[PDB]
């Protein structure tokens, strides 16, 4: 493409920061042409899911809408297959640069809404005060440990063969740093579980009569009639995560 960089009479081609060709001076004239790599980029697929529908939209992350049925250009790239609708909704499938994306039996793209608009009736003589009250219970899930894996460096790399074992022994201590690191991680997982759970030096036990003033804790207290004395909720957690 044309350029506005005035090359000096003695240079033929120009370079940009970090050693790349930026422009070159046409040998047969005095023109100076900039060289830009032609548009390319990764391709992203927007899918609601085969469980719901096999409809798909495809986004080209860094090209215009001139390079190969609605076609909409966004700051994230050129998205084909999704119709852009003016009204905002809660963000569902992330696209990028403020647009998210299924409704009305087609894939739609829109500017995300940040929440309902709610102005506060501020005044210097008016206070709102609650006249009733709701107790809510929320669930917060946190990882504490992960599977204590261990890989035998020498037998993994050099399966039961002395000939390769000699070369691996010529590679020094690598097969000892890896075992040491994995052992450290294995012990640190037990330390994590201990610090998360082992916070009471003695094991307390619930009374046999659940006369808690109308509160019912049967859903979180252990059930002795089960082979593993876990609560119903803990049962749901152990039956809900699959390997």
């Amino acid at each position: 493409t044309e350029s506005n960089k005035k090359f000096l009479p003695f240079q033929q081609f120009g370079r940009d920061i970090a050693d790349t060709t930026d422009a070159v001076r046409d040998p047969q004239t005095l023109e100076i042409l900039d060289i830009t790599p032609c548009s390319f980029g990764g391709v992203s697929v927007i899918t609601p899911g085969t469980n719901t529908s096999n409809q798909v939209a495809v986004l080209y992350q860094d090209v215009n809408c001139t390079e190969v049925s609605n076609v909409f250009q966004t700051r994230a790239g050129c998205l084909i297959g999704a119709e852009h609708v003016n009204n905002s909704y809660e963000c569902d499938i992330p696209i990028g640069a403020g647009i998210c994306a299924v409704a009305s039996q087609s894939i739609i793209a829109y500017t995300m809404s940040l929440g309902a608009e709610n102005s506060v009736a501020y005044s210097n003589n008016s206070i709102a005060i609650p006249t009733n009250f709701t107790i809510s219970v929320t669930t917060e899930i946190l990882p504490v440990s992960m599977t204590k894996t261990s890989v035998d460096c020498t037998m993994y790399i050099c399966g039961d063969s002395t000939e390769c074992s000699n070369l691996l022994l010529q590679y020094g201590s690598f097969c000892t740093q890896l075992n040491r690191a994995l052992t450290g991680i294995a012990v640190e997982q037990d330390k994590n579980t201990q610090e998360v759970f082992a916070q009471v030096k003695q094991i307390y036990k619930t009374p046999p009569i659940k006369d808690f003033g109308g509160f019912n804790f049967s859903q979180i207290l252990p059930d002795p009639s089960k082979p593993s004395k876990r609560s119903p909720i803990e049962d749901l957690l152990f039956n809900k995560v699959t390997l």
């Binding site: 980029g41 403020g98 009736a121 005044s123 008016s126 709102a128």
Partner: protein, 191 residues
């Protein structure tokens, strides 16, 4: 910027939406104090809110009402001075500039590695392909693949560590967002 194979994806929340979120949090703090964090936005006059905030630090609320004008003037003077403070003392934004500098330097030093032969005959794979026969170009291209892949691996590893550090800072930022803006903290020098 755009080189060979390197892309930057845009953030999902544009600066306009981040500004709109901080405007929402400021309107909440101003018109309803800390109650918009716990539940619904409850209207409170700003002096009564600041009287609550004085009550929470062991200074009786009347101290606000008798000194309301002095408090307003000192708060306005400090808020006005913050602009000159951060705009006149260099390095004040170093914690944000350093992240950008490290990312740009990592990308530039990832690109610069492409112009290194890595022990072969020429850092351009097309030149070794055009000057050596395939049965012999194979080894030099193996060199230019192993070295470049090791460079990409080092870059990705350092990006994983830096992402962990920035995630720690983001978690502390969310903790401050909740425990300093959305409420009032009794934790000393935390806010």
């Amino acid at each position: 910027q755009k080189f060979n194979g390197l892309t930057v994806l845009p953030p999902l929340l544009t600066d306009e939406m981040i500004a709109q979120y901080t405007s929402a949090l400021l309107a909440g703090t101003i018109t309803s104090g800390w109650t918009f964090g716990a539940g619904p936005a409850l209207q409170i006059p700003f002096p009564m809110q600041m009287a609550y905030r004085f009550n929470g630090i062991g200074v009786t609320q009347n101290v606000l009402y008798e000194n309301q004008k002095l408090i307003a003037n000192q708060f306005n003077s400090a808020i006005g001075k913050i602009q000159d403070s951060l705009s006149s003392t260099p390095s004040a934004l170093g914690k944000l500039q350093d992240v950008v500098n490290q990312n740009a330097q990592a990308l530039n030093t990832l690109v610069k590695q492409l112009s290194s032969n890595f022990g072969a005959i020429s850092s351009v794979l097309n030149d070794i392909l055009s000057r050596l026969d395939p049965p012999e170009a194979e080894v030099q291209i193996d060199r230019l693949i192993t070295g470049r892949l090791q460079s990409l691996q080092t870059y990705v590893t350092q990006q994983l560590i830096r992402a962990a550090e920035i995630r720690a800072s983001a978690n502390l930022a969310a903790t401050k967002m909740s425990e300093c803006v959305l409420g009032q903290s009794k934790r000393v020098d935390f806010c």
